[PDB]
DNA sequence: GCGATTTCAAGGTGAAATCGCCACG
DNA sequence: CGTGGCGATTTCACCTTGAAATCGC
């Protein structure tokens, strides 16, 4: 029942769950303490993009995902959000894939993120400042290209980019506002 | 015409020589020289406009000069209003009836129009992406210095994830 | 009350620190 | 001798687990 993630456990467990079973049958048709059902659901429900982030999610301890499933609705639970973080945390993410370390400590150190960069988007929503996130890093001084929501605002912002570019954007951005 | 004769006593503007000398390495008035340096000024995204530069009279170019001036003057935005009326350019290039002059001062009333509301909306550009009836509510473009940004307000959260999406890759290919 | 969940004490575990045993100048 | 090497061991900090206390209706 380990060889693979108390998730696909809980891929199990829900899917009786779904039947119309109570946790407390479920222990029992299993043979697993309705203490761990919970778990091995508590985990199946972690945020599917959050967990997608990690590397070796066998290294992903439940605790881990309690709070990886916590702060997956603390944040909404809603596609937007969870977009949204990770293009935050991404660049400095993979970063964390150059550098040395076992297992252990990108874990740890992934969520640290996961947890930080969310937990600094969480603020702005509330005091409804406006998030920028720079869409894509480059070495240069002046050229830039991000993103920034400030509520129900949106806008895309590039500076020293390509015609190529503008061209493209342009043609797409004007015909996918002729398709909705 | 003025301005031909502009950008020439131009090279020797930086020939490193004086108005004054060139009016007589040229026997132009000097006054004449002003105004052909004054005209050699004009906007060449804006004069180029014009199927017969011969027809625009100094007044017109001291007036492209001015809506370059009052847009900021840098290709990017001239760019903007040169597409955003591109097709009546191609358009009223197409009519037959009115006579070359009428040409030119359609073109340029066209050329004055963007100018005035590009910049109202703005120094910056910005052109109205699509018009939604909302007095909150809108999907537009702007430029200004070398950057452009697409500003959107009030929409389904549907097209954000695509814009998102979209974009997101339009990138990941070029920077690539 | 009664499932579901969290808490508690009692085991695991691995990474890192220490230890053993050795072989070499 | 005095050392450094390096595979095995032990430590230590964190896990998981079932049971039983606790929750939250």
Same mark, same amino acid.
């Given at each position: 029942?380990?060889?693979?993630?108390?998730?696909?456990?809980?891929?199990?467990?829900?899917?009786?769950?779904?039947?119309?079973?109570? *946790?407390?049958?479920?222990? =029992?048709?299993?043979?697993?303490?309705?203490?761990?059902?919970?778990? =091995?659901?508590?985990?199946?429900?972690?945020?599917?993009?959050? %967990?997608?982030?990690?590397? %070796?999610?066998?290294?992903?301890?439940?605790?881990?995902?309690?709070?990886?499933? =916590? %702060?997956?609705?603390?944040?909404?639970? @809603?596609?937007?959000?969870?977009? *949204?973080?990770? *293009?935050?945390?991404?660049?400095?993410?993979?970063?964390?894939?150059?550098?040395?370390?076992?297992?252990?400590?990108?874990?740890?150190?992934?969520?640290?993120?996961?947890?930080?960069?969310?937990?600094?988007?969480?603020?702005?929503?509330?005091?409804?400042?406006?998030?920028?996130?720079?869409?894509? @890093?480059?070495?240069? @001084?002046?050229?830039? =290209?991000? @993103?920034? %929501?400030?509520?129900?605002?949106?806008?895309?912002?590039?500076?020293?980019?390509?015609?190529?570019?503008?061209?493209?954007?342009?043609?797409?951005?004007?015909?996918?506002?002729?398709?909705?």
């Amino acid at each position: 029942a380990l060889q693979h993630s108390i998730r696909e456990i809980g891929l199990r467990l829900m899917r009786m769950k779904n039947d119309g079973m109570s *946790q407390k049958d479920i222990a =029992a048709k299993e043979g697993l303490s309705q203490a761990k059902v919970t778990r =091995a659901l508590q985990a199946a429900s972690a945020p599917e993009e959050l %967990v997608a982030l990690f590397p %070796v999610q066998s290294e992903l301890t439940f605790s881990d995902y309690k709070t990886l499933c =916590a %702060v997956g609705d603390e944040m909404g639970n @809603k596609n937007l959000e969870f977009d *949204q973080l990770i *293009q935050n945390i991404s660049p400095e993410i993979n970063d964390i894939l150059s550098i040395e370390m076992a297992e252990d400590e990108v874990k740890n150190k992934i969520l640290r993120l996961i947890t930080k960069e969310a937990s600094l988007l969480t603020d702005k929503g509330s005091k409804d400042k406006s998030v920028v996130t720079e869409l894509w @890093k480059f070495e240069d @001084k002046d050229r830039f =290209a991000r @993103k920034r %929501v400030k509520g129900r605002a949106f806008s895309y912002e590039f500076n020293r980019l390509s015609k190529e570019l503008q061209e493209e954007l342009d043609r797409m951005i004007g015909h996918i506002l002729r398709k909705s």
